[PDB]
């Protein structure tokens, strides 16, 4: 088998992005290249051709947001008419155009030039910064990840995380529910005997709620249901909608049509937002927000509770699906987890008391971090030689599969909340070439339910007397992710299987192009750093030897007034060049740190 170095455990949220490491009987989450153990899942562009990821490119969306890409995991494994992603892409500042049915995010790479991404390639970028963020802790290079995905994340939804994990370079060796995640972070060291433990995860982009199993290492996922387009940049969006209206009220002024306003808007608005769950009211201030004129109001809580109330009833209803399919009651229900960084509102909180008749949730547990912790120990156990505790894991598909038939009927095949690794047969005596229409969701009938794909099998062997009988096989594996074989019982050895899968997917020569730009764009970064790194090579040289020469103690005492001219002459002349010519390119430099050290060589050396 493969030796997969050391696995890393990613959480490849919405608005964040965490990643772990299993080592020394211990889970270390990694900061970044600023110090910071999260990692915002941005991407941006810069008109001067540079292209930034996480914190930089956050800090820089205001001033530059129609190509600052952000929440794509609200896109990734999408088709373009999903209701959706047409009321995304309503308040998105980066254009989100179709093609292949999928939506593309579209932006200004630099000098008047327009790349189309796929939501995956941007999660690709993101993911390879967590990639690096890694190398850099362990000083040595990383090919194996688990990831996260939300627990109601559908067939689409999966593999399209996982390709976006082989365009960063990374062997996605699972896919991990980041309910089951942070469960394995609350409850991998208890030894209480078995409890039923509801994690309830609430983020920036999606809500999933589990109910598990957990028997001291045995962790067993019994029911799952969730929102996977519900989460804080909702709870944001709805502040928006509002203090704009409140803004044209009072000034006149409709300010939607001015993406860098809006933005300023989301900004604060989102800091507003967090004080406010552990404060009453919180200042909204935004200096000079539209045309020159600055915005300033207030938003209590009790405000921003109106405005989201529907939104954070509507958590229950998972919740109370999760319970009937558990064939449990709210009582039966030990403890309550709370993760994801939405929890820390304390409407959310109470809710979820109420729900249980005045039980309080579970505190000690990171809801930033959990998910990832889990991960990390997932990658621990991965990785081979770690010493971990006992785990065991049994994780289930969050939605039922079925086939098409005569009308539109969702014929049930594998229900909803099975254990995965799971499998089913049916045979089939309809010979030529059948059209097998998959589908997903609890609906009786197909128009109400989501297409996964569209199977055709072109083998069957043709008979003498009449109609071929096929075993179609639909496996639904590890990840989550559906595969679909197939078997004639008319032949002893040859057995005839052909799919062609009509589905929504990046091809194999798709995703080639993808990694191969990535490593494109990796050298291109290289290089622009080997022409900075070089360029200050230049630029200390040269105040280097301006020191030297002015010091009459060391190296200038020893010069006389002929070599003494020439010299601050060709160090002077290469600083006020230096000044002048920033956008020069790598060998400028090079031919230039020549010149200095063609003059200063004879020189020194008497
Ligand atoms: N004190 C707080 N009050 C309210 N919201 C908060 C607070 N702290 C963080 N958040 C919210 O948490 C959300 C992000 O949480 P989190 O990082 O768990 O989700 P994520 O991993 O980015 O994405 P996903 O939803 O896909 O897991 C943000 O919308 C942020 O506004
Ligand atoms: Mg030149
Ligand atoms: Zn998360
Ligand atoms: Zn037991």
């Not at 850099?136 to 990831?147: I, N």
């Not at 009651?329 to 109470?350: A, Y």
Request: proline share 4%; with cysteine; hydrophobic share 35%.
């Amino acid at each position: 088998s493969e030796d997969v170095g050391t696995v890393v455990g990613i959480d490849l949220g919405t608005t964040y992005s965490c990643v772990g490491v299993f080592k020394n009987g211990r889970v270390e989450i990694i900061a970044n290249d600023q110090g910071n153990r999260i990692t915002p899942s941005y991407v941006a562009f810069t008109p001067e051709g540079e292209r930034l990821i996480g914190d930089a490119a956050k800090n820089q969306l205001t001033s530059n947001p129609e190509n600052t890409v952000f929440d794509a995991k609200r896109l990734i494994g999408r088709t373009w008419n999903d209701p959706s992603v047409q009321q995304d892409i309503k308040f998105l500042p980066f254009k989100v155009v179709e093609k292949k049915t999928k939506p593309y995010i579209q932006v200004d790479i630099g000098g008047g030039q327009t790349k189309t991404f796929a939501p995956e390639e941007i999660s690709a970028m993101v993911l390879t910064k967590m990639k690096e963020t890694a190398e850099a802790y362990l000083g040595k290079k990383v090919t194996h990840a688990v990831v996260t995905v939300p627990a109601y994340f559908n067939d689409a939804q999966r593999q399209a995380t996982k390709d976006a994990g082989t365009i960063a370079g990374l062997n996605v060796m699972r896919i991990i529910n980041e309910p089951t995640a942070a469960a394995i972070a609350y409850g991998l060291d208890k030894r209480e005997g078995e409890k039923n433990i509801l994690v309830f995860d609430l983020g920036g982009g999606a809500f999933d709620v589990s109910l598990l199993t957990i028997d001291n290492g045995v962790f067993e996922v019994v029911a799952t249901n969730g929102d996977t387009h519900l989460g804080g940049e909702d709870f944001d969006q709805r502040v928006m909608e509002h203090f704009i209206k409140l803004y044209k009220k009072k000034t006149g002024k409709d300010v939607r049509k001015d993406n860098r306003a809006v933005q300023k808007l989301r900004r604060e608005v989102e800091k507003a937002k967090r004080a406010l769950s552990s404060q009453h009211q919180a200042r909204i201030e935004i200096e000079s927000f539209y045309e020159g004129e600055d915005f300033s109001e207030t938003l209590t809580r009790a405000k921003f509770e109106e405005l989201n109330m529907d939104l954070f009833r509507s958590t229950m209803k998972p919740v109370q699906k999760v319970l009937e399919d558990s064939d449990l009651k709210k009582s039966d229900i030990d403890e309550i987890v709370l993760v994801g960084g939405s929890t820390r509102i304390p409407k959310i909180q109470q809710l979820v008391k109420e729900f249980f008749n005045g039980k309080e949730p579970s505190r000690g547990i990171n809801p930033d971090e959990a998910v990832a912790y889990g991960a990390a120990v997932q990658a621990g156990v991965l990785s081979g030689d770690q010493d971990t505790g006992d785990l065991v894991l049994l994780d289930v598909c969050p939605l039922t599969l079925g086939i098409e038939t005569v009308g539109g009927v969702m014929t049930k095949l594998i229900p909803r909340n099975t254990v995965v690794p799971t499998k089913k047969s049916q045979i089939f005596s309809v010979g030529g070439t059948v059209t097998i229409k998959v589908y997903e969701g609890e609906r009786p009938l197909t128009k109400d339910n989501h297409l996964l794909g569209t199977f055709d099998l072109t083998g069957i062997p043709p008979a003498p007397r009449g109609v071929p009988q096929i075993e179609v096989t639909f496996e639904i594996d590890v990840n989550g992710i559906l595969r679909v074989t197939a078997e004639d019982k008319g032949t002893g050895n040859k057995n005839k299987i052909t799919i062609t899968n009509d589905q929504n997917r990046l091809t194999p020569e798709e995703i080639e192009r993808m990694v191969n730009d990535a490593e494109k764009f990796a050298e291109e970064d290289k290089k622009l750093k080997e022409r900075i790194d070089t360029r200050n090579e230049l630029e200390s040289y040269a105040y280097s030897l301006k020191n030297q020469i002015g010091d009459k103690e060391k190296l200038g005492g020893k010069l006389s007034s002929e070599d003494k001219e020439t010299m601050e002459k060709a160090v002077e002349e290469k600083i006020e060049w230096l000044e002048s010519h920033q956008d020069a390119d790598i060998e400028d430099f090079k031919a230039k740190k020549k010149e200095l050290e063609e003059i200063v060589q004879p020189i020194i050396s008497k």
